[PDB]
């Protein structure tokens, strides 16, 4: 997260770290045994880490669980990042508590102008790379699809939504991928892509979660 702030310890209880020897992506706990992330964060073996604040220091609230089933959206296109959503079934259910809690699926698509919360342990620099130890937070609004499409001519699909600032300075970045953008207690987006980090007129684009509520529920039920 570029231009964000350090989240209060365990204030984003649904945030998880996808670890494969190191943190490489984020995700959201949607129920005691399922995590939603980005298809582009796929790996054959993943250890999901919950109750994290400092990813490099044991603080006493962590629960490390291995992924049992990693299911990318069937129509994920690695070239356009369309349908960039993935579901992970944990090998065993986690203990839900204050620092480890679930986030709700969207009941409807949030209107542009809605203020949302983005979080992650991704790169904090607009140029270069700096991986933070502590979970970062960013308060950003959903942008009008018109401004989104205008920023990325021909690249924005109906399954994508821009969140951020047209002036730059604040944005998601590498390592935040798969992470959540929660608006009013509901998961409205998933960190997906951008051509840089925190650049003017180049807001980050996220997977529009409201378009997959059905697929999510179905896949969960059938697995
Ligand atoms: O420009 C790119 C790719 C991004 C993926 N890509 C397309 C091209 C067309 N349509 C969809 C995706 C081709 C160019 N990258 C540079 C930035 N990196 S990144 O710094 O690791 C990154 C990763 C995720 C991000 C997510 C957000 Cl929401 C904002 C910036 C982000 C930046 C990703 C690859
Ligand atoms: Ca820790």
Residues recognised as catalytic: 40, 84, 177
The closest ligand to the CA of 59 turns out to be 2
State which approach was used to obtain the coordinates: X-ray
Structure tokens at 166: 């047209």
Same domain, 195 and 169: yes
Q: Is the shortest distance between the CB of 2 and ligand 1 below 6 Å?
A: no
- Cα(30)–Cα(65) distance, integer angstroms: 15
Q: Is the shortest distance between the CB of 124 and ligand 1 below 6 Å?
A: no
Tell me, in angstroms, the distance from the centre of ligand 1 to residue 223's CA.
31
Q: What is the resolution of this structure in A?
A: 2.3
Same domain, 22 and 113: no
Same domain, 117 and 199: yes
- Cα(147)–Cα(88) distance, integer angstroms: 32
Same domain, 122 and 206: yes
Same domain, 33 and 7: no
Tell me, in angstroms, the distance from the centre of ligand 1 to residue 199's CA.
12
- Distance, CA of 12 to chain centre: 12
Same domain, 193 and 222: no
Same domain, 147 and 164: yes
Q: How many CB atoms lie within 10 A of CB 146?
A: 11
In terms of residue numbers, what domain contains 167? 1-12+103-210
Same domain, 34 and 142: no
Tell me, in angstroms, the distance from the centre of ligand 2 to residue 139's CA.
23
CB 86 within 8 A of CB 78: no
What is the number of structural domains in the chain? 2
Same domain, 40 and 118: no
Same domain, 4 and 81: no
What is the domain-level CATH number for residue 54? 2.40.10.10
Place of tokens 């993935």: 86
Q: Considering only CA atoms, which residue is closest to atom 15 of ligand 1?
A: 195
Same domain, 111 and 203: yes
Same domain, 90 and 127: no
């Amino acid at each position: 997260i570029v231009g964000g702030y350090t989240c209060q310890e365990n204030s984003v209880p649904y945030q998880v770290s996808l670890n494969s020897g190191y943190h490489f992506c984020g995700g959201s706990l949607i129920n005691d045994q399922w995590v939603v992330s980005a298809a582009h964060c796929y790996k054959s073996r993943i250890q999901v880490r919950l109750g994290e604040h400092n990813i490099n220091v044991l603080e006493g609230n962590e629960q490390f669980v291995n992924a049992a089933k990693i299911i990318k959206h069937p129509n994920f296109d690695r070239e356009t990042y369309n349908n960039d959503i993935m579901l992970i079934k944990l090998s065993s259910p986690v203990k839900l508590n204050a620092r480890v809690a679930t986030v709700a699926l969207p009941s409807s698509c949030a209107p542009a102008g809605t203020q949302c919360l983005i979080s992650g342990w991704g790169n904090t620099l607009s140029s270069g790379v700096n991986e933070p130890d502590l979970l970062q937070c960013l308060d950003a609004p959903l942008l009008p699809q018109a401004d989104c499409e205008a920023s990325y001519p021909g690249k924005i699909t109906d399954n994508m939504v821009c969140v951020g600032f047209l002036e730059g300075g604040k944005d998601s970045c590498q390592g935040d991928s798969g992470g959540p953008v929660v608006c009013n207690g509901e998961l409205q987006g998933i960190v997906s892509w951008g051509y840089g980090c925190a650049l003017p007129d180049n807001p980050g684009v996220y997977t529009k979660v409201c378009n997959y509520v059905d697929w999510i529920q179905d896949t969960i039920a059938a697995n």
